[model samples]
Target: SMVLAALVLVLEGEGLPEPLGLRGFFYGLLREVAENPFALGFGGREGAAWARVSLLVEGLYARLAPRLYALEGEEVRLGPPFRVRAVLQEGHPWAGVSTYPRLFQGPPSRDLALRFASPTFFRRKGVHYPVPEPRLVLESLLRRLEAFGPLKAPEGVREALLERTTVRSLEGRTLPARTEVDTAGFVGRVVYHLPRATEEEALWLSALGRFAFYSGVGAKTSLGYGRARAESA
Candidate 1:
């Protein structure tokens, strides 16, 4: 099995608005925690630079910090200073987390079986598309992992894994996803589906999968559109 490390972040209320502007909050936190924090959130620099992380948003509610408000449209105007939990992961140990222990915590697994805790979207022809197939998911994950280094799976090995794997099951619905930079797009969730992977396949997939928890799967992860987790299934 492949081993890795993660940094979990917990943001307590200073309640914000509906949609909570979470991506912005998250981006700030990461920049603040910089220790070779990459300019790109998806992976790293040039080639061979996977972001090596994923984010999970949990325990969300529509309660006012003090004075609750009425619901508006599909979005609920929430209280400022709300509590939000974000899980950040890295394939290798991160020095930034150690420097700011209070800002980061530990992850629970080396092997991950993740579900789209948040709506995940992919890109196509300059327009955004919801992730609808297992191949796309694995391909995205593989590309990100390949960004890390030469320690990636070989061409034949990756092709074999893709050819052999299948989506055993899927259960997801659309979500209200938006970014600070843009306003139109669609996102979806994917339920657990076992993929047939051998020992070598599993090792590469696990190594990459763990980071997918942090790097996110589709377009606009840095803006919080593709946050996911391995433990919430």
Candidate 2:
């Protein structure tokens, strides 16, 4: 809960509570999830109650913030097309939801942090950082996506996001993995974790901020984490 308080402080530092705070129609987020029903409530189920709340909070932030600030009459995609080809494709639903907004939101806003919970069109299996660390992994992925630039796009990423198909970052231990989209219409499953601690929570927000910078750029977010971070290994 202290970690969430720190996060709230950070958001306040960034002026989130003002323009974006839930006013009237809005209610301040439940900063302390220690008492949340989703959690074990002092060791009942021992679930990821706090982490769930953090993700929800971050998701709402991404949703409300103007990624590109939009043009006068320009309409941002803001959502997956909701097609049968995507919905019934197993993990594709997550991929499409997670990945599509990046394409139209521009290269800098792919916002892959929460994508582990969604999907993209390419099925390319998006990548996340702090891979071995489950708690901060999604936030790491978001940061990586945000920080990526055009020079980062590999040949595969370019081809996939443009001519071939939409890209996806699947849930997994692997840094980046490619999956078949329409080629054979093969489907795959997503990866998940057990739980997290308070200290690790800090990394989540920082990493997610970094991803917002990269994923929002270039044309290859679909290919995977851009080549810049991909090759520096």
Poorest stretch of ten by lDDT in candidate 2: 35-44
Computed on alpha carbons, the lDDT of every model, listed in order, comes to 0.43, 0.23
Best candidate according to lDDT: 1
Output the number of the TM-score-best candidate: 1
| Residue-wise C-alpha lDDT for candidate 1, range 10-121, written one tens digit per residue | 2333433323343444344445443111212322133222122232221111111111112111221122333323323323322111111211133322234556655677
Model 2 has an lDDT value of 0.23
> Model 1 TM-score?
0.54
TM-score of 2: 0.20
**TM-score of every model?**
0.54, 0.20
lDDT of candidate 2 over 1-233, digit per residue (tens): 10110011111011111111222112222242111111000000112111011112233334322221221133211121111111111231111122323223322222223222112222224622222222233333433333332223344333322232212334333222233322211112222221221222223323333333223211123322221111100
Displacement of residue 121 (Cα, Å) in model 1 is 0.6
